Amino acid sequence: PSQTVELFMMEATLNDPQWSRMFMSFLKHKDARPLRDVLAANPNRFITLLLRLDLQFQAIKIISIIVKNDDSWLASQHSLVSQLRRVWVSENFQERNWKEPKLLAYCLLNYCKRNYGDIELLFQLLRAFTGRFLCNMTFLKEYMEEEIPQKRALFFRFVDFNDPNFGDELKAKVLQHILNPAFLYSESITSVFITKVLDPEKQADMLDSLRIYLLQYATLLVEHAKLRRLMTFAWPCLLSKACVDPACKYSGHLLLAHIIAKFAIHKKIVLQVFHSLLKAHAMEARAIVRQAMAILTPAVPARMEDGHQMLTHWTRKIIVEELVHILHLIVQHFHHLVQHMVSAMQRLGFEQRRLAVDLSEVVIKWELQRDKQHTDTVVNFLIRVACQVGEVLSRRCVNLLKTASELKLQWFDKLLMTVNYGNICTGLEVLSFLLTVLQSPAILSSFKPLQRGIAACMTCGNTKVLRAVHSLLSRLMSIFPYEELECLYAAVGKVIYEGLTPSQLFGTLMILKSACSNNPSYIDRLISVFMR
Amino acid sequence: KLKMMQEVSENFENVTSSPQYSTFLEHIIPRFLTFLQDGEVQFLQEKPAQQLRKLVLEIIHRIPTNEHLRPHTKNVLSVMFRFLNVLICLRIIIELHKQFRPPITQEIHHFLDFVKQIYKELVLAELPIIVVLMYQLYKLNIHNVVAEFVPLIMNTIAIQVSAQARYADFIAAQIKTLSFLAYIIRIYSQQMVKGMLQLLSNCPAETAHLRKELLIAAKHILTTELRNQFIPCMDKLFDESILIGSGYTARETLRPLAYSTLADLVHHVRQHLPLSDLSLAVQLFAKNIDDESLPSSIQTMSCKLLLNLVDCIRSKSEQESGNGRDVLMRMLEVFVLKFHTIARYQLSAIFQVTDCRSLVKTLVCGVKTITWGITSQLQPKETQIYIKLVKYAMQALDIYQVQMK
């Protein structure tokens, strides 16, 4: 082979793209190992080459092919990297190429896999943004599965830092990203003591992404070998015009809460951080505030009566200002909050009815642990969920209530006013309150409103309204074993019977079924005519 | 006693009243008119003299009625208008409007004098925003459009940075005002392109918070047909640069909306965009189609848009044929990148499955259309790319088969 690579295949012929592609096709052949070897033994012509752009890309292609054939070909790394880094850094201003940067980065990473984290591992992050760089990013992210298997001692200052003086903070961002899993997976040596204070570099602002990730990492770093030092990290952006994105606010506040959870349950900060965390977020910082609040969630009840759970005073303002769906969760995880449980129903209406379902479990928990505030709130929740027409949560409400009226009187008219959506919903409309009457004297106490309502409802039997009739006749068959409503409905059934003179037949016979059963005591008069 | 009751207004009033809907409204309103009528506030100085008067807000909060505000709307609004930071008055006026949305009232045609209390620019936009929000009672009959018409906004969206430093006291107010102005002109090219980009490049620099409401308003205004199909086309897509939402992961949270909104733009400006603009658009979507920042929703939308984009590019490229072939090679390189993403979808085999199926459908239609375009050393590279496509497509169909018509 050795004659080919220089007979009609030297640099002067690499200008032709088809010729180069044919050469790379030969090189790609698995069995052509000697043809690749003739070059693998002579990296000098690559070294002379890579310091033009077309031949640079061709050299990258050929060297990447060689490395793919022989990944162990790191012997020339110590000479190749010197210019590989040069071109890797330079190409950013050259373009920022079809596949060249990804190939070059793959070569750099492969040579890096022969060592743990070092300068080149930092530098290979430089470009990014090209082809979305997912190839190289995944390559390196998977490479931590090998890197993590002792390099941590001073990684913070021999892989980080290094002042590339060309790249931006993304160098620190991605390095911290990959640093976190190594510490999560795996001594509290003295170096960390000094590093925790070297971190800020005694800067005065540190209000950036780097602080966010660094504090997120250090949140678990304070076990054992004070308050003022942590204060410098936690406090800084309380400056007025800064910290406009609550992300950095909540990161520092979460770290502080972790400090509070550790030993620092003090009246200086404990009541200050809480009422300030739940503010200033509207749509996206809500996903950040919840986790920070989770850390204070166990800490606050550790005081409880010592603070009187005074946060009702804060709520008196917050409810007017804006959300408050964090206050009662202490009981759900499990006391005197029933005195203001009314706020849940008070704040609804033009809407987020979900809180009622959430608070039903808390209310039953209160009842088991320790009311008139429940018997009306439950009916209000029931009617408000019925306004949707939903979900088994509405049934869950009553199910939990009965372990230890308004909607009834509303829904008779709510069906009388009938409309396609109403017709569809009619089954749920009736079922919502007809499920309670099967387990309460609600109808037996007074069925006259129902007689007023339902008497003009079964006549609308069609599609889903028929299913409503099926539901209601079932309740009739339970109530009967009221005579006036039975007589009215029997008259309705008889007139429908005479109406025939098969959907009509289906409705007629279903009403006849409703009238029937109930023990034969009442069916004889009906049966007298069924022959026709 | 009246002066110190403000701090204890919760006591002795809820006990001694009940019809306060129509019996103590006529008590609060005169109290408000007697308390707030002085207004010795200051806006360009230190803490104002009236700083001690803030306590009246609780009494304002305790306004009784949600109906029949006709005799008590205009007077209370006007006495506030006498005030001419300015938030000292906005705090009261916002409550006045907040309690004013429900009740029925009239003579709101005083908008022509109200505007004199609104931006002049020789936080104020909040009041017209709540006005247009509860406008359901009267709708455009009160003012037509004049309060926010073209001539008001054509002056560089009526707002521009006057001082480079002063910085929240000025820039935050400007941030809110621009958003409210956009949200009100929503109803109804120099402003909404040039001022749009100029403010994008300068205003959200603090921590990029502005981009949230600004981008939502941009979506809403771009829903309005001609304001999307024709008016913004002057940009030449040059606003697709970094200026749109640069910053922290607030960028990550809002960029999906920005990309979807500009995709909506493209859906229509596909009608007439030139070949170079289409080329740079497909270039950006080449990065989009594989972005890790969001689930396949963005990737699906990007390829779906690319479908009609390449329809238009196929229509255009046949003319002069040379730039046509040039762009053809790179558009098929885009789906070369797509097959390369499939090469990782292979490993991704380890609900979202339905989204992946939809993505496969979309990109299959895309490659079909791309090939249709190509057919309407070229062949050897065609064969190479098709070999890659065939080898990688089975790896996606295998996930397609996971656990049909």
Side-chain angles (χ1 to χ4, degrees):
Chain A
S2 303
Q3 183 157 350
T4 64
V5 294
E6 295 291 351
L7 175 65
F8 203 11
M9 224 186 238
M10 84 320 277
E11 190 175 324
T13 57
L14 296 181
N15 296 297
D16 187 317
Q18 189 60 16
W19 208 272
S20 307
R21 198 62 51 107
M22 171 294 307
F23 178 25
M24 291 305 327
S25 82
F26 291 176
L27 294 155
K28 276 177 170 183
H29 198 293
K30 278 64 173 176
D31 193 28
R33 153 61 89 155
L35 185 59
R36 296 185 291 267
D37 188 31
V38 52
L39 266 62
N42 297 285
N44 302 312
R45 42 179 151 216
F46 309 136
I47 293 161
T48 56
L49 191 163
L50 208 65
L51 288 165
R52 197 269 298 279
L53 306 175
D54 50 356
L55 46 91
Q56 161 192 306
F57 169 46
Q58 288 164 324
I60 294 304
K61 190 66 167 280
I62 191 157
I63 207 169
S64 56
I65 282 297
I66 286 164
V67 169
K68 284 183 73 166
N69 159 76
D70 190 332
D71 78 308
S72 45
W73 192 69
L74 64 88
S76 197
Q77 175 190 213
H78 314 81
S79 57
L80 292 165
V81 168
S82 72
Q83 49 174 229
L84 293 165
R85 203 275 295 274
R86 199 287 307 180
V87 66
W88 167 248
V89 169
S90 301
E91 195 59 26
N92 301 283
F93 53 66
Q94 295 300 138
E95 190 282 315
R96 206 89 300 277
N97 279 275
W98 310 265
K99 286 288 295 297
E100 183 182 5
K102 290 182 174 185
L103 300 165
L104 169 58
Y106 169 60
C107 292
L108 269 307
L109 177 135
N110 194 301
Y111 277 174
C112 282
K113 279 165 56 67
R114 320 305 156 171
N115 191 15
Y116 285 98
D118 61 18
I119 179 62
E120 304 309 326
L121 183 64
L122 177 150
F123 250 105
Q124 57 79 47
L125 301 166
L126 197 130
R127 183 159 185 174
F129 321 136
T130 317
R132 293 288 81 181
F133 211 52
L134 176 69
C135 312
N136 196 69
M137 271 305 178
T138 49
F139 299 164
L140 79 94
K141 256 87 182 201
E142 270 78 324
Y143 162 66
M144 331 325 298
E145 273 59 67
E146 175 171 33
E147 215 286 338
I148 293 167
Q150 55 301 320
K151 203 72 163 179
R152 317 293 113 68
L154 293 170
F155 193 99
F156 193 93
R157 61 184 78 172
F158 68 71
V159 184
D160 202 359
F161 177 46
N162 287 312
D163 187 11
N165 65 85
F166 178 67
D168 67 66
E169 44 170 40
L170 184 66
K171 58 100 178 169
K173 295 179 193 178
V174 182
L175 286 182
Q176 215 300 308
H177 278 64
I178 60 171
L179 181 143
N180 295 331
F183 283 89
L184 285 162
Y185 182 85
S186 64
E187 61 184 313
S188 62
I189 183 158
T190 36
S191 79
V192 174
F193 311 168
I194 305 302
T195 297
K196 183 63 214 78
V197 291
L198 181 145
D199 168 21
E201 290 280 30
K202 311 309 192 293
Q203 187 175 0
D205 185 354
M206 311 75 78
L207 294 184
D208 58 49
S209 179
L210 308 189
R211 173 176 169 267
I212 289 168
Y213 301 143
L214 289 162
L215 297 191
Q216 163 252 297
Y217 157 74
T219 296
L220 48 60
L221 195 68
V222 299
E223 298 286 27
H224 85 92
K226 187 186 295 183
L227 282 295
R228 303 286 84 80
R229 173 164 51 88
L230 301 157
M231 212 35 206
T232 67
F233 318 134
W235 202 240
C237 38
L238 270 292
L239 301 179
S240 182
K241 76 100 180 175
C243 216
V244 169
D245 182 358
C248 42
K249 188 178 207 288
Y250 294 159
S251 304
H253 286 33
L254 186 145
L255 181 142
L256 186 66
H258 274 78
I259 302 306
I260 287 162
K262 282 255 66 182
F263 43 80
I265 316 181
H266 301 164
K267 41 73 167 181
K268 179 61 171 72
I269 58 176
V270 68
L271 81 176
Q272 187 270 348
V273 64
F274 189 98
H275 83 273
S276 64
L277 264 173
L278 81 179
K279 296 171 68 173
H281 63 267
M283 187 274 292
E284 84 291 36
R286 185 72 177 183
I288 311 178
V289 75
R290 296 286 290 193
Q291 50 267 60
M293 281 315 188
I295 310 302
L296 304 177
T297 294
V300 174
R303 309 282 66 231
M304 183 47 159
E305 301 291 7
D306 287 357
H308 198 70
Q309 199 69 358
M310 161 294 288
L311 47 61
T312 57
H313 186 284
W314 298 335
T315 306
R316 171 173 165 183
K317 178 58 57 174
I318 296 289
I319 198 74
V320 178
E321 292 192 340
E322 176 55 291
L323 288 161
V324 296
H325 317 309
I326 186 62
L327 300 168
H328 305 283
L329 279 291
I330 277 67
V331 181
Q332 175 54 24
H333 303 319
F334 150 82
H335 309 290
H336 66 290
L337 285 59
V338 297
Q339 70 192 12
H340 56 72
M341 164 57 198
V342 177
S343 59
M345 52 75 88
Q346 184 270 353
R347 196 57 160 75
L348 283 169
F350 297 98
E351 173 274 318
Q352 186 39 276
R353 66 281 199 187
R354 285 170 184 163
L355 83 168
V357 174
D358 199 7
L359 263 295
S360 68
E361 189 165 313
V362 187
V363 172
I364 180 54
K365 290 250 64 173
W366 278 318
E367 186 168 334
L368 178 63
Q369 176 190 17
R370 201 171 186 164
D371 302 335
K372 64 183 184 287
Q373 54 81 13
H374 181 193
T375 53
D376 57 1
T377 302
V378 70
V379 180
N380 279 269
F381 287 176
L382 255 293
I383 190 173
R384 274 185 164 143
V385 298
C387 280
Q388 297 199 134
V389 290
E391 293 76 69
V392 298
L393 312 168
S394 63
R395 313 322 315 166
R396 292 282 79 71
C397 289
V398 184
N399 184 195
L400 295 175
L401 162 68
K402 291 301 186 182
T403 65
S405 39
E406 279 60 35
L407 78 159
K408 178 193 170 189
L409 76 98
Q410 262 65 243
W411 252 237
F412 305 134
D413 73 66
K414 185 63 163 64
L415 184 46
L416 285 167
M417 28 51 64
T418 55
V419 294
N420 63 333
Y421 185 74
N423 271 257
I424 291 159
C425 288
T426 297
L428 297 172
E429 299 281 48
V430 303
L431 166 143
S432 296
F433 69 88
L434 290 181
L435 275 163
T436 70
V437 312
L438 292 173
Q439 56 191 295
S440 63
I443 285 176
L444 287 305
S445 62
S446 181
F447 58 86
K448 240 64 80 183
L450 189 147
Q451 180 181 343
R452 160 263 178 154
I454 299 299
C457 293
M458 79 283 276
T459 55
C460 307
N462 81 92
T463 63
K464 291 278 282 189
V465 182
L466 291 161
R467 279 70 179 178
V469 174
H470 314 343
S471 305
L472 77 88
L473 69 90
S474 308
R475 276 76 183 169
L476 300 183
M477 302 216 168
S478 307
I479 297 151
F480 294 179
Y482 73 79
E483 48 263 44
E484 55 261 39
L485 51 73
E486 189 276 333
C487 290
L488 286 182
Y489 303 173
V492 168
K494 287 167 65 171
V495 295
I496 290 166
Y497 178 109
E498 294 290 67
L500 178 72
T501 291
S503 57
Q504 197 281 342
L505 289 168
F506 176 77
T508 300
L509 73 89
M510 264 312 316
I511 290 168
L512 294 183
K513 176 181 171 73
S514 81
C516 287
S517 185
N518 313 317
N519 310 119
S521 182
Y522 299 117
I523 75 180
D524 54 359
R525 58 225 69 181
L526 320 170
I527 295 285
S528 75
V529 55
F530 283 13
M531 282 65 67
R532 195 272 290 153
Chain B
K1 79 194 289 272
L2 261 60
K3 289 290 181 177
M4 163 303 300
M5 306 344 300
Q6 307 177 98
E7 307 172 29
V8 299
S9 49
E10 183 66 7
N11 299 94
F12 305 117
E13 296 301 331
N14 292 14
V15 176
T16 57
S17 68
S18 170
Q20 59 57 70
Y21 298 112
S22 58
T23 64
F24 276 87
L25 178 65
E26 302 81 0
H27 181 289
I28 295 291
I29 292 294
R31 286 272 69 83
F32 179 94
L33 294 167
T34 45
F35 294 163
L36 283 299
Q37 45 63 40
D38 47 18
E40 60 275 334
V41 298
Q42 289 81 41
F43 315 127
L44 307 166
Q45 303 293 347
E46 254 289 359
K47 205 72 186 175
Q50 186 146 110
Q51 58 88 5
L52 67 94
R53 201 257 313 125
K54 293 289 294 297
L55 294 169
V56 302
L57 284 166
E58 184 161 13
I59 297 177
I60 293 157
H61 151 76
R62 287 167 192 288
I63 192 165
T65 199
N66 56 16
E67 183 55 293
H68 57 266
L69 199 75
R70 179 62 186 94
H72 306 137
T73 301
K74 176 60 163 62
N75 40 37
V76 296
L77 288 170
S78 303
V79 289
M80 281 335 297
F81 294 167
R82 190 56 264 189
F83 290 46
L84 303 188
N85 198 356
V86 298
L87 59 95
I88 189 65
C89 327
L90 203 84
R91 185 68 190 84
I92 297 150
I93 302 157
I94 284 165
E95 295 291 352
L96 291 179
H97 286 78
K98 185 70 155 61
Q99 65 89 44
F100 141 76
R101 166 174 82 86
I104 272 61
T105 183
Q106 249 298 350
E107 90 177 85
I108 306 304
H109 66 277
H110 84 281
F111 96 91
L112 194 51
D113 185 30
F114 197 1
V115 289
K116 314 306 177 181
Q117 319 302 154
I118 295 161
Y119 39 68
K120 291 164 282 291
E121 319 321 287
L122 301 177
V123 302
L124 287 67
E126 187 147 20
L127 311 183
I129 271 289
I130 181 62
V131 166
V132 76
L133 183 55
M134 47 40 61
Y135 216 2
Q136 276 64 247
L137 278 66
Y138 332 100
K139 294 298 201 179
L140 302 181
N141 298 288
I142 295 292
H143 83 312
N144 189 26
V145 66
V146 304
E148 62 276 354
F149 195 44
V150 171
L152 181 274
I153 56 170
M154 69 184 186
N155 308 286
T156 61
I157 190 51
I159 304 174
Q160 164 64 332
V161 173
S162 59
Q164 298 178 357
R166 280 194 171 189
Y167 190 38
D169 303 337
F170 170 86
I171 201 68
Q174 177 167 293
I175 282 163
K176 188 157 71 158
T177 314
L178 268 307
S179 79
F180 287 153
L181 183 58
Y183 275 122
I184 187 156
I185 64 178
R186 165 181 50 132
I187 307 302
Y188 192 81
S189 308
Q190 287 81 4
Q191 54 277 8
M192 61 76 88
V193 176
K194 290 300 211 296
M196 202 46 258
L197 77 92
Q198 288 294 351
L199 69 77
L200 282 166
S201 52
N202 188 298
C203 206
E206 187 61 34
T207 324
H209 167 217
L210 162 67
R211 283 279 292 169
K212 181 160 64 207
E213 303 84 2
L214 185 68
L215 184 57
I216 294 166
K219 167 72 181 194
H220 278 87
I221 58 146
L222 270 291
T223 62
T224 59
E225 294 65 43
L226 266 292
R227 316 302 159 77
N228 178 329
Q229 184 265 350
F230 185 68
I231 280 80
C233 84
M234 78 182 236
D235 57 15
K236 314 293 93 173
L237 314 182
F238 68 168
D239 58 348
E240 293 183 357
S241 304
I242 283 69
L243 84 166
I244 46 151
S246 186
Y248 192 52
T249 59
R251 186 230 283 109
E252 265 56 24
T253 60
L254 297 169
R255 270 285 170 105
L257 185 56
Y259 288 123
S260 51
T261 44
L262 60 91
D264 289 341
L265 266 302
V266 170
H267 275 300
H268 307 88
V269 299
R270 152 186 57 92
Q271 172 59 6
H272 56 288
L273 275 166
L275 199 57
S276 306
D277 292 357
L278 297 166
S279 182
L280 55 75
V282 299
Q283 193 172 357
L284 171 60
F285 299 130
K287 295 184 282 284
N288 288 116
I289 188 53
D290 197 28
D291 200 301
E292 178 176 19
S293 60
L294 192 77
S296 165
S297 61
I298 182 172
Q299 299 191 9
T300 43
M301 152 295 299
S302 49
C303 62
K304 189 186 295 183
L305 185 77
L306 272 159
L307 299 193
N308 58 35
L309 272 164
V310 301
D311 266 321
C312 180
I313 295 155
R314 180 275 323 303
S315 307
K316 206 277 180 190
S317 47
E318 292 202 318
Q319 298 91 57
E320 314 101 32
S321 323
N323 52 5
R325 234 67 197 157
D326 183 45
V327 66
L328 278 154
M329 322 334 298
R330 197 161 195 152
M331 52 152 33
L332 63 79
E333 194 198 325
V334 180
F335 274 88
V336 170
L337 188 143
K338 181 35 62 179
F339 323 139
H340 281 82
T341 76
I342 297 177
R344 181 63 185 204
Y345 301 169
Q346 182 271 332
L347 294 174
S348 83
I350 305 300
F351 184 61
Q352 173 262 20
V353 295
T354 67
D355 199 22
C356 293
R357 286 161 74 114
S358 81
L359 176 57
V360 171
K361 158 64 176 181
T362 41
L363 68 89
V364 164
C365 295
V367 63
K368 188 179 182 191
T369 51
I370 293 273
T371 47
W372 156 233
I374 316 318
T375 49
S376 60
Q377 69 285 341
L378 311 93
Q379 268 79 355
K381 302 299 178 286
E382 281 197 79
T383 55
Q384 284 291 111
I385 299 311
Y386 297 144
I387 287 284
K388 294 263 276 182
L389 157 69
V390 168
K391 286 193 76 175
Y392 293 135
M394 311 315 88
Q395 304 299 332
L397 274 306
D398 273 323
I399 302 169
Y400 200 114
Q401 177 258 278
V402 168
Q403 203 65 245
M404 172 26 46
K405 310 308 179 183

